Amino acid sequence: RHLKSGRKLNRHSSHRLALYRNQAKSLLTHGRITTTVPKAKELRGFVDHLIHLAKRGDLHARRLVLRDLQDVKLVRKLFDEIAPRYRDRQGGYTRVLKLAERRRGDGAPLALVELVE
Amino acid sequence: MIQPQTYLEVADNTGARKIMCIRVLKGSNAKYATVGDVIVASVKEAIPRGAVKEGDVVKAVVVRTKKEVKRPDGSAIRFDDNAAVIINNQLEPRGTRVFGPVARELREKGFMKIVSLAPEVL
Amino acid sequence: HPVPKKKTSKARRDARRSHHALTPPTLVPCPECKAMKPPHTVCPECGYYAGRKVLEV
Amino acid sequence: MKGILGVKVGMTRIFRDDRAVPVTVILAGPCPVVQRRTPEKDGYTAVQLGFLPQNPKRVNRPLKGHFAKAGVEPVRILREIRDFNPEGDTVTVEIFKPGERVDVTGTSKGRGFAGVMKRWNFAGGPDSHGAHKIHRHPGSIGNRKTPGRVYKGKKMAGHYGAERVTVMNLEVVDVIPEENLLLVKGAVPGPNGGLVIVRETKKAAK
Amino acid sequence: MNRGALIKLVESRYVRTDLPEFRPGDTVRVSYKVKEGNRTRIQDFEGIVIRIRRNGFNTTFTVRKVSYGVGVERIFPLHSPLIQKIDIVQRGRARRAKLYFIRNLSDREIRRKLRAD
RNA sequence: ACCGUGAGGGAAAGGUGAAAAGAACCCCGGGAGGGGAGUGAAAUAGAGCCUGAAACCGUGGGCUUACAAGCAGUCACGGCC
RNA sequence: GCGAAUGCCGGCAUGAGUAACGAUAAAGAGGGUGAGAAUCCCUCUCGCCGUAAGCCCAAGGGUUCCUACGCAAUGGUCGUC
RNA sequence: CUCGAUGUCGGCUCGUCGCAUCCUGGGGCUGAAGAAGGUCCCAAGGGUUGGGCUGUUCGCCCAUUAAAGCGGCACGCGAGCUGGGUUCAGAACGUCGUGAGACAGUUCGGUCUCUAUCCGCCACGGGCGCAGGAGGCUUGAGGGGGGCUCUUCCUAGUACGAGAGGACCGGAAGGGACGCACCUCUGGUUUCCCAGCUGUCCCUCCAGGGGCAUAAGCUGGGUAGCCAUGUGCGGAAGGGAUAACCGCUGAAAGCAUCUAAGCGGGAAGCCCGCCCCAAGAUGAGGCCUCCCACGGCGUCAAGCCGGUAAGGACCCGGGAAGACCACCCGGUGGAUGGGCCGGGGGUGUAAGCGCCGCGAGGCGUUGAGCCGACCGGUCCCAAUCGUCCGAGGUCUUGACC
């Protein structure tokens, strides 16, 4: 069992992928989103790559990302509306930033992360 | 690759190309009827006539499955598990034998006769 | 099954809750306005270091 | 009979025939950082370093404990007893040559905190008739009025990951005289890409 | 640098091109000769023809257990760069898919369809 | 009241103040509840609010404490205050 | 005129801020209301039922059902529900 | 003592002393030629297999082996399993009893609870100190770990010999079981990495996808990490003192004896030499470097404040170190993470269009398409900005400048 560990994840894989997706999506919707510390760390890694194909561009890159988030509206909104703007940059198309505040009863430290303008 | 209580083919005069070995002869602490080794046992399978019977001898390890890493890093794994029955002196008991070349055996060496004996496309 | 015996009493509850102890929050001046904040997070005023995008509505 | 270093990985190599494998060891420049000369420190020895990590960052004292006979920009430092210094800087290259016998060691990869299961051998209890602690767990800790209690120093669960140790004897096999590298054929005595060293004793029969 | 770097190097040094064989092919039952020898440095262009099963991959690699039918099934795994080998000539096919470890053959072949692939 | 199927079982809780004069209004607060002002002989008599001690929990001051194995204590002595 | 009866009644500590929150059918986002909302409201992602967690009659319950306010108590915390 | 109670067999799991020593060596002895035996004294170091049947520890049998020892701790172990056993009602027979019911004669089933307080063990940190205040390199009193053993061959077939048979002495090689690391090889996993697949509801009909078919629906494969069945290594020499047992020089026993005198030999055993702990050994710290004596008040002012970043702490970003924790490297004058990028190893030629085929699909562009931890570039993203605490350096005696 455990030692040298790569890609830090919680819940259960099906859930995880579930989240990564949903949030990846909601964000693509709002540019900037609010969640808990790692929610962000990772959502960063994933939405990072995702927008990377968004830009990647073409019938394929597209087909892939839809394979993923299942919805044209966005599909496109993304792939052709912002993706480009980024497309020339260099990965890390996102900004993960911690806030000074915790969710209730728990103290969960959270923050916001968004398409990186 | 190894075993104690075991079921393995042979092919010599073998009244049954199979027996069951208690243990590896070597240094008291067998634990692995090792390739190219030798062991203790009884027959499990039937011998029409034969002369072999349903007794027990001493024999040498041929084939095996799971890791024949020869010294020079030459390698092979047999998809069968057998030995040649030895009759205690070591010297083998039979006419022929079904199996091919591949030193590991000869590396043991003593049984060259085996060596010569079984040697082809079978 | 395994109930202790009685308590070094004070001695105990103490020694223990003691090494326990409780501290306060590490903090510094705002990367912009007033008060302070933690090692890296905007806040309901000087909402930034480069683009607040946060403080009041 | 001493080399200082950071090692890479164990990998196979061929020989007169077959092959087997060694491990990649690299020792840039072991250099005389301080000498404990006996009148100084009885366990007379050579204290050295072997590389250089970013200069911007550099404690003062260090800057000078160094200054002493001044060297440079590393942080990799330690030392060995009864090892004269036929130099004011040694390498590895030639320092050691293959066909030579070596002893060597360093950090011990960091396992974790595992009971009888791990820790030691005899992988705990059993499984089929007993599942109230299923397959295995921890043996027996002592006795009533035997000593009247629990023992005092037998194997035990826990931290058995972060420690230090050594490889008695192993082979020099070969030296790549430039980037002070050695293929040793040894038990990769600790993580790769890490703290490792060479020392060599063997006044005994075979 | 590190690993990749230096090591890549040393091996390069002795392993050298494994006699530019680059004759990987699929699982071709192809045929070869290893110096494999003993007794009086009787090294022999030993040749086993065999249906190749997979391989080991970096400096040290291996033209895998090409399985061959002798008396029964017997499989031969070879160390690639290893000077042990001299001759490695292709006879059979680098044909049919799914990636090795398809011992399907040895498994329960029937040379019939065995062939059929 | 409450437990029990029915039979049946079968507690707790008395004492704010002389008399209500028992809490305007201002001050933090979502409130509570806390600070003032007036009651008043007292309110450390304030709504469970007489007298309200023991247990245990708190805040502050003196002495005290990290080479130490003693239910307790305690006889002597020295250092503190 | 009482340590003392594993006594009786009523306080009060002790484990202990570890055990534990009632089913391994998952959540996450956005806006919203608010004194404060992981834990209320609308809305957009996603999982679990579905022959049941679905509809219905009857039994037994007996308030409650709604609408408006309200949370100090009660939900094994939260809570403007 | 114990009954307001001490859970008794057997077996696991983990053992720990003992020697009347099984195997290991050292030994004087022989009815010792060699060899191999048997006989005692010394020495517990290490070692002291697998099955079978029986709830049996015992024991008999199978096959080995150097051997496969006896026995101490409630015949060690239920707050650590197991519970066949014996030791709750049944029902059973055999057996008794006029029977009730019985038999330590059998036989078939028959509810081991356990959220650690002490002391104790194994580990991990917060203290406060080894009288300047600091970062890093050390030597260890002494504490711990391993100390086994078999087989082949040379000198040798000579020493012995009638012959069959085989020595010291000493030197090689291989293995057994065990301990310590570690992945290259071999190998196992790999919960998402790749590929095929059935059924079904949705996307938008098509193909081209999506969840659910466990917490992956089903398969065939798969790094890296963790990991044997896989790989290196070890159990040493060797030095000093000793056991039994042997001698030496020698009287007291005016010859003689290892003997009180003084000398030497001498076991895998003992001390050391091998590794791994460690001055909270307050009875070290040894050494390298470097900060320098601030301010304000009753003084043996070893008391209150800013003080040196001399340093280090916090928080941030990371780490095969890791429950926490501390450990460790970095924080933008930096590659630390992730993103990207190239590169190793993955799946096994994609999505589309093109081509033969009623068709099913086949073939081509594609050995492509997609790729999680692997080697490494690159500030594209996010390590901003800041805070605190942290010497002034006791008294006394001796020594030098």
UniProtKB/Swiss-Prot annotation, chain B:
Give the PROSITE patterns listed for this entry: RIBOSOMAL_L14
Q: Which UniProt keywords apply?
A: Ribonucleoprotein, Ribosomal protein, RNA-binding, rRNA-binding
Task: Show the InterPro entries listed in the entry.
Answer: Ribosomal_uL14, Ribosomal_uL14_bac-type, Ribosomal_uL14_CS, Ribosomal_uL14_sf
Name the Gene Ontology molecular function terms of this record: large ribosomal subunit rRNA binding; structural constituent of ribosome
Gene Ontology terms: cellular component: cytosolic large ribosomal subunit
* BP term (GO), one: translation
* Presence of the UniProt keyword Transport in the record: no
Cite the Pfam families for this sequence: Ribosomal_L14
As for what it does, the entry says: Binds to 23S rRNA. Forms part of two intersubunit bridges in the 70S ribosome.
Which family is this protein grouped under?
Belongs to the universal ribosomal protein uL14 family.
NCBIfam families reported for this sequence: rplN_bact (TIGR01067)
Report quaternary structure and partners. Part of the 50S ribosomal subunit. Forms a cluster with proteins L3 and L19. In the 70S ribosome, L14 and L19 interact and together make contacts with the 16S rRNA in bridges B5 and B8.
State the protein's name. Large ribosomal subunit protein uL14
Source organism of the structure: Thermus thermophilus
Curated annotation (Swiss-Prot), chain C:
The free-text function statement in the UniProt record for this protein reads:
Found on the solvent side of the large subunit.
Q: What is this protein called?
A: Large ribosomal subunit protein bL32
User: What keywords are assigned to this protein?
Assistant: Ribonucleoprotein, Ribosomal protein
Does this entry carry the keyword Ribosomal protein?
yes
GO terms for cellular component: large ribosomal subunit
Q: Where is the composition biased (Basic residues)?
A: 1-20
GO BP annotations listed: translation
Which residues does the annotated region (Disordered) include?
1-27
Q: Report the source organism.
A: Thermus thermophilus (strain ATCC 27634 / DSM 579 / HB8)
Per the record, the similarity remark reads: Belongs to the bacterial ribosomal protein bL32 family.
Curated annotation (Swiss-Prot), chain D:
Superkingdom classification of source: Bacteria
Kindly indicate whether the keyword Cell inner membrane belongs to this entry.
Answer: no
- Enumerate the HAMAP family for this protein: Ribosomal_uL3_B (MF_01325_B)
Does Ribonucleoprotein show up as a keyword for this record? yes
Assembly and interactions?
A: Part of the 50S ribosomal subunit. Forms a cluster with proteins L14 and L19.
Which keywords, in A-to-Z order, does the entry hold?
Ribonucleoprotein, Ribosomal protein, RNA-binding, rRNA-binding
Tell me what gene encodes this: rplC
Q: Which GO terms describe its cellular component?
A: cytosolic large ribosomal subunit
GO molecular function ontology, one term from the record: rRNA binding
Q: Output one GO BP term.
A: translation
The similarity comment for this entry is: Belongs to the universal ribosomal protein uL3 family.
Q: Which InterPro entries match?
A: Ribosomal_uL3, Ribosomal_uL3_bac/org-type, Ribosomal_uL3_CS, Transl_B-barrel_sf
Q: What does this protein do?
A: One of the primary rRNA binding proteins, it binds directly near the 3'-end of the 23S rRNA, where it nucleates assembly of the 50S subunit.
Can you name this protein? Large ribosomal subunit protein uL3
Swiss-Prot record, chain E:
Q: What does this protein do?
A: Contacts the 16S rRNA of the 30S subunit (part of bridge B6), connecting the 2 subunits.
Give start-end ranges for the coiled-coil region(s): none
Q: Which GO terms describe its cellular component?
A: cytosolic large ribosomal subunit
Gene field: rplS
Source taxonomy: Bacteria, Thermotogati, Deinococcota, Deinococci, Thermales
Quaternary arrangement and interactors, per the entry? Part of the 50S risobomal subunit. Contacts protein L14. Forms a bridge to the 30S subunit in the 70S ribosome, contacting the 16S rRNA.
Question: Its Gene Ontology molecular function terms?
Answer: rRNA binding; structural constituent of ribosome
**Family recorded in the similarity comment:** Belongs to the bacterial ribosomal protein bL19 family.
GO BP terms in the entry: translation
Q: What is this protein called?
A: Large ribosomal subunit protein bL19
Q: Which residues of the full protein are shown?
A: 1 to 117 of 146
Q: Which UniProt keywords apply?
A: Ribonucleoprotein, Ribosomal protein, RNA-binding, rRNA-binding
